[PDB]
Coordinates of C-alpha atoms and ligand atoms in Angstrom, one line a residue:
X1 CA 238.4 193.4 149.7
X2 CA 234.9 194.0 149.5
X3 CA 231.6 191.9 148.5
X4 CA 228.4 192.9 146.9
X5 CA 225.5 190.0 146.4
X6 CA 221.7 190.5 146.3
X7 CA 219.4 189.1 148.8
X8 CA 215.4 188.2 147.0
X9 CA 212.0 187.9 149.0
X10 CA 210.7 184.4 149.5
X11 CA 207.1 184.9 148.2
X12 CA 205.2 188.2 147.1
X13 CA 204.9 188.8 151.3
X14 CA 208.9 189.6 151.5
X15 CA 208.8 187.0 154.3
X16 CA 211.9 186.2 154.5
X17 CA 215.2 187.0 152.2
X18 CA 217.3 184.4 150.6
X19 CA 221.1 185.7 149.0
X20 CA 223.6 183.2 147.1
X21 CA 226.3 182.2 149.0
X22 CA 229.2 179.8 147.4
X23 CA 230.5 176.8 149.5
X24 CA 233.5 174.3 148.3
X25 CA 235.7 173.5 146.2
X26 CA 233.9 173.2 143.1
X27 CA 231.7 175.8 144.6
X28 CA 228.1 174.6 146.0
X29 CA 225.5 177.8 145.6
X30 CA 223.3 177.5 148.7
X31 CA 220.1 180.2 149.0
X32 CA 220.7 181.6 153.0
X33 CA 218.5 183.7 155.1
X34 CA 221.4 186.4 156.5
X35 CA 220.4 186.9 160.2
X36 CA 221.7 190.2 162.0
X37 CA 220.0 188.1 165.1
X38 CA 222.2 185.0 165.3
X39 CA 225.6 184.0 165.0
X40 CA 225.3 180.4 162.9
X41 CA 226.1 179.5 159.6
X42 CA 224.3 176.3 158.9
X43 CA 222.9 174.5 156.4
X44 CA 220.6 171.9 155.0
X45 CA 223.4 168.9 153.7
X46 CA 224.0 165.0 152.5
X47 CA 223.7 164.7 156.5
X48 CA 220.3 166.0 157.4
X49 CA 218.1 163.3 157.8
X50 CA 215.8 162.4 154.9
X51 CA 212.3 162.8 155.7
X52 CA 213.2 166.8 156.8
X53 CA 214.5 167.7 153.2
X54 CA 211.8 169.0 151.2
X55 CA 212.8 170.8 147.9
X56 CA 216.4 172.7 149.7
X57 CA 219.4 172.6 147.9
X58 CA 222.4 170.4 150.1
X59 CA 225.5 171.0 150.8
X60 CA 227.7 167.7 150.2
X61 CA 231.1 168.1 152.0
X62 CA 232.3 165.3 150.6
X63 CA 232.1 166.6 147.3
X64 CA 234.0 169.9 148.3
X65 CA 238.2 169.4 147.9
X66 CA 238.4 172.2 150.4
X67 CA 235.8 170.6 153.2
X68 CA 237.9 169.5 156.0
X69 CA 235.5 167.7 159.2
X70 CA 235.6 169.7 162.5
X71 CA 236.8 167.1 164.9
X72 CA 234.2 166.8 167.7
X73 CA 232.3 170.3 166.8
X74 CA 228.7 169.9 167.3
X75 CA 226.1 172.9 166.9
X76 CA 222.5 173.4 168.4
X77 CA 220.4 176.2 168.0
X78 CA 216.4 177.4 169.1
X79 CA 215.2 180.4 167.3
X80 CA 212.7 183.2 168.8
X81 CA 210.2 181.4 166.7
X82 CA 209.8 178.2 168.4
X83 CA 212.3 176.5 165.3
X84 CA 215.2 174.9 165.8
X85 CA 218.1 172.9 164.0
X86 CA 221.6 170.8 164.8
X87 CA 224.3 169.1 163.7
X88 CA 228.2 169.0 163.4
X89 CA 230.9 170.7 161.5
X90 CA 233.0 171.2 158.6
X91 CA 235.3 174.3 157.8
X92 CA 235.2 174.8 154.2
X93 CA 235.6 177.9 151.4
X94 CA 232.4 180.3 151.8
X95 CA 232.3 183.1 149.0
X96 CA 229.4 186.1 149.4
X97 CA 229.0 188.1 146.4
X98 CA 233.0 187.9 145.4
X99 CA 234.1 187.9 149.4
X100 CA 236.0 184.9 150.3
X101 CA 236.7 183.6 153.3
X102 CA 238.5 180.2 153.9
X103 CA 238.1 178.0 156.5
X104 CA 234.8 179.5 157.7
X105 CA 232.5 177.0 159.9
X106 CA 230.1 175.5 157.8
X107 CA 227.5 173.9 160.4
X108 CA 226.0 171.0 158.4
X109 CA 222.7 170.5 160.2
X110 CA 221.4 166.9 161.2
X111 CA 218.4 168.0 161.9
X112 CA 215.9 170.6 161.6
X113 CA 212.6 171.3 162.9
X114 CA 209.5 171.3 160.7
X115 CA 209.5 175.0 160.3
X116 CA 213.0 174.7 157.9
X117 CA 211.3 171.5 156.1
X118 CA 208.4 173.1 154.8
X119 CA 210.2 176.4 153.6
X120 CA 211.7 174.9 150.3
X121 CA 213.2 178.0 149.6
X122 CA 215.9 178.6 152.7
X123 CA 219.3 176.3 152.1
X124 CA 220.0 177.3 155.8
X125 CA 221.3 180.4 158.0
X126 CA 224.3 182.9 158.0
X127 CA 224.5 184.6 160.8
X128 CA 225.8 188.1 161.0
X129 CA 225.1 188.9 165.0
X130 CA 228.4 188.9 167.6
X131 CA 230.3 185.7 167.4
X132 CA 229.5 185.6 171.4
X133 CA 226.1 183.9 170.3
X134 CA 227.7 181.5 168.0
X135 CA 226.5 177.6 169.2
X136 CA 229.1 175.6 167.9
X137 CA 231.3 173.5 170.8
X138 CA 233.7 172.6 172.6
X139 CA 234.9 175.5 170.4
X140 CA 233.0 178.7 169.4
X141 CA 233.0 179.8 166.0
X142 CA 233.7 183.4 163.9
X143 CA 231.0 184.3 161.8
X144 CA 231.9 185.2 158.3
X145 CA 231.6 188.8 158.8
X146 CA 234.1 188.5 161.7
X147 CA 236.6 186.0 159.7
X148 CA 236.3 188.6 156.5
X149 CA 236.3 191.7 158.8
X150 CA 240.2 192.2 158.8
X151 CA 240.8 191.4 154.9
X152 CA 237.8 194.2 154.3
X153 CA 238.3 198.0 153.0
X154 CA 235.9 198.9 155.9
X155 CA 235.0 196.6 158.7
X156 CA 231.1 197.1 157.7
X157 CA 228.3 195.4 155.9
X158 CA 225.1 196.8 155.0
X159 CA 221.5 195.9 154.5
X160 CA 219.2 197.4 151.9
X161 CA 216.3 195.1 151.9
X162 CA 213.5 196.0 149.2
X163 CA 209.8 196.0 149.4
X164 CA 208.0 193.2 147.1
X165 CA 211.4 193.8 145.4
X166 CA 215.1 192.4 145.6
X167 CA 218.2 194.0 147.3
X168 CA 221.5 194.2 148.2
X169 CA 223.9 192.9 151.4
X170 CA 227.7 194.6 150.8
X171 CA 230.6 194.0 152.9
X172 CA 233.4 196.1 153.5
X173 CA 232.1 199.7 151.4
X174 CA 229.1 202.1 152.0
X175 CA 227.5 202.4 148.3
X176 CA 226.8 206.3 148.7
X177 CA 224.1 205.6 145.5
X178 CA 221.6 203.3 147.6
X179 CA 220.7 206.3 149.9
X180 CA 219.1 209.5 150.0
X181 CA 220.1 212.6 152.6
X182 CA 222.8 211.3 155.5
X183 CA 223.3 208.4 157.7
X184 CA 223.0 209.1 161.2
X185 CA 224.9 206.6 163.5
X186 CA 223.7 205.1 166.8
X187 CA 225.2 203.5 169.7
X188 CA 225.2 199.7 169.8
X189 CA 225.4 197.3 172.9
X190 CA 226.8 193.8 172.3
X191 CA 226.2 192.6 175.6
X192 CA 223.1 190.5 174.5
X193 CA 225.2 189.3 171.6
X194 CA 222.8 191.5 169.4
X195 CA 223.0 194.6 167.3
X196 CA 221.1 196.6 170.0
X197 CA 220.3 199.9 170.2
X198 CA 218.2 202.7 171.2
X199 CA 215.7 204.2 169.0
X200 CA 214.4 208.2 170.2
X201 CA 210.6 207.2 169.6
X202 CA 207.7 206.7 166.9
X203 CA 204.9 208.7 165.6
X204 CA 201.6 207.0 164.3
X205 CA 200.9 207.9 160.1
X206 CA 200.8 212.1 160.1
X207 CA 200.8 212.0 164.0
X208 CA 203.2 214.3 166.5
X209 CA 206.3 212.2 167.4
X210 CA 206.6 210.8 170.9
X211 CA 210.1 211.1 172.3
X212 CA 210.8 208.0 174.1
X213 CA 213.7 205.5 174.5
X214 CA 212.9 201.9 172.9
X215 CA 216.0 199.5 173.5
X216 CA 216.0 196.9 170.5
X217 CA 217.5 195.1 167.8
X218 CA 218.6 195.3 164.2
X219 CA 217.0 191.6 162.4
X220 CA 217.1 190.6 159.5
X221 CA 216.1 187.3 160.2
X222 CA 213.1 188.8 162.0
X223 CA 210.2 189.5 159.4
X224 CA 207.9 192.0 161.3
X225 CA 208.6 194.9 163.5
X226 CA 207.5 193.3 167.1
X227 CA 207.3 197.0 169.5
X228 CA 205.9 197.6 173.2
X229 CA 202.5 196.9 173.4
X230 CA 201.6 201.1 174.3
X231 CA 203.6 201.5 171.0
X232 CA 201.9 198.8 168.8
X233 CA 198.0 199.7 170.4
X234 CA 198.8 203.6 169.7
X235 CA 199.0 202.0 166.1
X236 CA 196.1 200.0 165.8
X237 CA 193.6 202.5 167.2
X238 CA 194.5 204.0 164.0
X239 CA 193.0 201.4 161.8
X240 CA 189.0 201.1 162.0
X241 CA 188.5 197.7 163.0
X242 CA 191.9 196.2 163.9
X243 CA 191.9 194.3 167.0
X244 CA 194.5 192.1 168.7
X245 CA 193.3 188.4 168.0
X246 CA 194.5 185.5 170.5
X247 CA 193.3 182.7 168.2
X248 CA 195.3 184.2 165.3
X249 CA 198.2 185.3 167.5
X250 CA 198.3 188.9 167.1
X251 CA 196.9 192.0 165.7
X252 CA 194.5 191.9 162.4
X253 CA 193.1 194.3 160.2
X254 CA 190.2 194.2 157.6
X255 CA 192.1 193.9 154.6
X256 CA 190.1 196.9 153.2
X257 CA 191.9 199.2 155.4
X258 CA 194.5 202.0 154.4
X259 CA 197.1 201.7 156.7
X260 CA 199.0 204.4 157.9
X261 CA 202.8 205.0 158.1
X262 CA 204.8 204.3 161.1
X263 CA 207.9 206.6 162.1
X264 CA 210.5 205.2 163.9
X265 CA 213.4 208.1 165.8
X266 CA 217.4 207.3 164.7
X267 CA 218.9 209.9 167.1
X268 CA 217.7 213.4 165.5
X269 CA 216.6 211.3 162.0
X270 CA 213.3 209.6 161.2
X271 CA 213.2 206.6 159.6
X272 CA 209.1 206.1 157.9
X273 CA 207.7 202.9 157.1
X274 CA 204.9 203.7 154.4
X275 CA 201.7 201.5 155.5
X276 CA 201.8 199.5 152.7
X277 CA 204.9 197.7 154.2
X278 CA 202.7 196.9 157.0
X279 CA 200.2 194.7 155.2
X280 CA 200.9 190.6 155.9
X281 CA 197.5 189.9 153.7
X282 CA 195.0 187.3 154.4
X283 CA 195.2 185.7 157.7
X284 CA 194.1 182.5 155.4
X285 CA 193.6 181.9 151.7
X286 CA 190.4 183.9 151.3
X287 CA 189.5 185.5 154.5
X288 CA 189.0 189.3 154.8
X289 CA 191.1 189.3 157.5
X290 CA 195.0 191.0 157.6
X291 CA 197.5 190.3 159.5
X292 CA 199.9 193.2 160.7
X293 CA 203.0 193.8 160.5
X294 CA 203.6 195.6 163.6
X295 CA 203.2 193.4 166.7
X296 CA 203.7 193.3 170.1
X297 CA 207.0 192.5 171.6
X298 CA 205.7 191.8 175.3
X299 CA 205.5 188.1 174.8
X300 CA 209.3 188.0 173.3
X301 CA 211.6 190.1 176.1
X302 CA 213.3 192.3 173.5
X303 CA 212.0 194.4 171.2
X304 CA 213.0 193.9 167.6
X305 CA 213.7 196.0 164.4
X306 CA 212.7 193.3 161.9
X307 CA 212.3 193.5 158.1
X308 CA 209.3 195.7 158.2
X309 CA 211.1 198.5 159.4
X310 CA 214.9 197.1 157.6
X311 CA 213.5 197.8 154.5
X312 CA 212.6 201.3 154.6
X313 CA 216.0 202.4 155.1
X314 CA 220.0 201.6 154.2
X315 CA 221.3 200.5 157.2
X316 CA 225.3 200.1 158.4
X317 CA 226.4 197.3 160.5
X318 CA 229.6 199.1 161.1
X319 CA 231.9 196.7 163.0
X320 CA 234.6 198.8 164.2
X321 CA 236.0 198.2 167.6
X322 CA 233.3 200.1 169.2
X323 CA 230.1 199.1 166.8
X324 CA 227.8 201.3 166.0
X325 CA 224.7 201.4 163.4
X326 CA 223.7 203.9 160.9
X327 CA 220.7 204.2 159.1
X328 CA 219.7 206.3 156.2
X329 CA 216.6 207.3 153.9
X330 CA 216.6 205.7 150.6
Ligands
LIG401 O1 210.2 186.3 161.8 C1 210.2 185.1 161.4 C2 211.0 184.6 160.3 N1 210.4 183.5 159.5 C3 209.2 184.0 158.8 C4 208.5 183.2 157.7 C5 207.1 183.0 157.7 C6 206.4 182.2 156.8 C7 207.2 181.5 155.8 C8 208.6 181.7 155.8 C9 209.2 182.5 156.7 F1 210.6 182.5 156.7 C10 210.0 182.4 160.4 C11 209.1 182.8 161.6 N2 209.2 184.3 162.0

């Protein structure tokens, strides 16, 4: 089998990507953020409590002939943003783009914190990291890559996130139309539960590459591209007048700048993120002020490969028995 649906920016920033998925029996469409960093597929529902629903579509189990109640399953979950969300669980009929996979965990959240309220346009998570990370107990649950894995042609999905544009998440094919040149594969570690890898080094807009080993992860559910602070400061001493603000929480720009490109090293390959993609716009309605889109990850303890650089390339989530990632030019 294979699946092929299209994932949309949020707003005109690409903060965030929202894809159809189908829930239930008649089928509920829900609008979920896929996350490459987590391992929960939850969403808002007839449970959560009133005053956090703001404008989300619900999931209603009871309206689903194929819901069936997890006995005694609850889920919790904190994000590396500071949000968080819980509940219990149903296992229900969960269709991606023509995939289906029954009896997937549907976490039906309870609760959310204020960050998932006042985002009207995210119906909840679906986690694509290792099922190691997955929160549900007394009993962890598969994520629906790892339930549809063994029905699949290829036991892959990929990512080709667009800039101010939609595009696409498939499962279980490489579409050898969506990229230019070859894919170069990469080692993986799941010991953190993530897709983590090594990337060979960066250069800075038409600047000589620096070979160096930086250990982080593929996120999709991560907007910007958070680096070591050497990395990120090699970058911004590029830009006349960028500085690293403390009141604002990270590196700004004067939004008259013309940023440069960044490079990132995929084994032998290069992978370049035109400057454009690094513009987050106005700090505030009306300032002159940018914020960036490259940021320090000393503050996080991982490095991650978030949207900003995603987006530039096709990239392979191959889930083989020993994973690996690939990404390619497009
Ligand atoms: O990397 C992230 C992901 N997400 C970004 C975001 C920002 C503004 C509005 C909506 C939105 F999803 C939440 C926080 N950090």
């Amino acid at each position: 089998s294979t699946g092929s649906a299209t994932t949309t920016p949020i707003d005109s920033l690409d903060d965030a990507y929202i894809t159809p998925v189908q829930i239930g029996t008649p089928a509920q469409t829900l609008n979920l953020d896929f996350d490459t960093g987590s391992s929960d597929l939850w969403v808002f529902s007839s449970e959560t409590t009133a005053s956090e629903v703001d404008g989300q579509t619900i999931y209603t189990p009871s309206k689903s002939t194929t819901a069936k109640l997890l006995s005694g399953a609850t889920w919790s979950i904190s994000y590396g943003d500071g949000s968080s969300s819980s509940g219990d669980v149903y296992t229900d009929t969960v269709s991606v783009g023509g995939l289906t996979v029954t009896g997937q965990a549907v976490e039906s959240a309870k609760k959310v914190s204020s960050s998932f309220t006042e985002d009207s346009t995210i119906d909840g998570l679906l986690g694509l990291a290792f099922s190691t990370l997955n929160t549900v107990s007394p009993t962890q649950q598969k994520t629906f890559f790892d339930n549809a894995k063994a029905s699949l042609d290829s036991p892959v999905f990929t990512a080709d996130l667009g800039y101010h544009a939609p595009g696409t998440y498939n499962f279980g094919f490489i579409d050898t139309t969506a990229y230019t040149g070859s894919i170069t594969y990469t080692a993986v570690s799941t010991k953190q539960g993530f897709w983590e890898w090594t990337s060979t080094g960066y250069a800075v807009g038409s600047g000589t590459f620096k070979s160096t080993s930086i250990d982080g992860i593929a996120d999709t559910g991560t907007t910007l591209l958070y680096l070591p602070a050497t990395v990120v400061s090699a970058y911004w001493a590029q830009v006349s007048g960028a500085k690293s603000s403390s009141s604002v929480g990270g590196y700004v720009f004067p939004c008259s700048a013309t940023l440069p490109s960044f490079t990132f090293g995929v084994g032998s390959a290069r992978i370049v993120i035109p400057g454009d993609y690094i513009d987050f716009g106005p700090i505030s309605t009306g300032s002159s002020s940018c914020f960036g889109g490259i940021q320090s990850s000393a503050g996080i303890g991982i490095n991650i490969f978030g949207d900003v650089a995603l987006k530039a390339a096709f990239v392979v989530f191959n889930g083989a028995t020993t994973p690996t990632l690939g990404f390619a030019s497009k």
